Amino acid sequence: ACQASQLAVCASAILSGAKPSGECCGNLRAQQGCFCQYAKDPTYGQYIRSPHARDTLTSCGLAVPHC
Ligand SMILES: CCCCCCCCCCCCCCCC(=O)OC[C@H](O)COP(=O)([O-])OC[C@@H](O)CO
Structure with a gap:
């Protein structure tokens, strides 16, 4: 939530x-x-569209946005 x-x-x-x-x-x-769903959130677009962001999630390789 x-x-x-x-x-x-x-x-x-x-x-x-x-x-x-x-x-x-x-x-x-x-x-x-x-x-x-946050992947659609524009206000936080800077958070998801970060350089190190994708790296952190990817490093883990659990779940990627844009679902
Ligand atoms: C209070 C402030 C906190 C902010 C809220 C955080 C919300 C959580 C969301 C974090 C998500 C970060 C992940 C980055 C998402 C992204 O930009 O996508 C990059 C993605 O990994 C790239 O996909 P791709 O490799 O181009 O996909 C094509 C491929 O699947 C086929 O070849």
């Missing part, structure tokens, strides 16, 4: 770009709902 918090911890990488993290790719899983 869109937590908007389980991913915040990752935002550090998406926005700033400190360093990825495994927990990140895991947090989204707990969602597997809004996270998927």
Whole structure:
């Protein structure tokens, strides 16, 4: 139901770009709902369309948006 918090911890990488993290790719899983549809969300388009974002999720290889 869109937590908007389980991913915040990752935002550090998406926005700033400190360093990825495994927990990140895991947090989204707990969602597997809004996270998927979020792919359409324009306001957060900068988050999903990030450079390190796709890398983090891909590194895990669990679920990719655009579903
Ligand atoms: C409160 C702030 C937090 C923000 C909310 C976060 C919401 C979670 C969504 C995160 C999603 C990030 C993943 C990046 C999505 C993306 O841009 O897609 C890249 C994708 O991996 C590329 O697909 P592709 O390889 O071109 O697909 C074609 C291929 O399948 C066939 O060859």
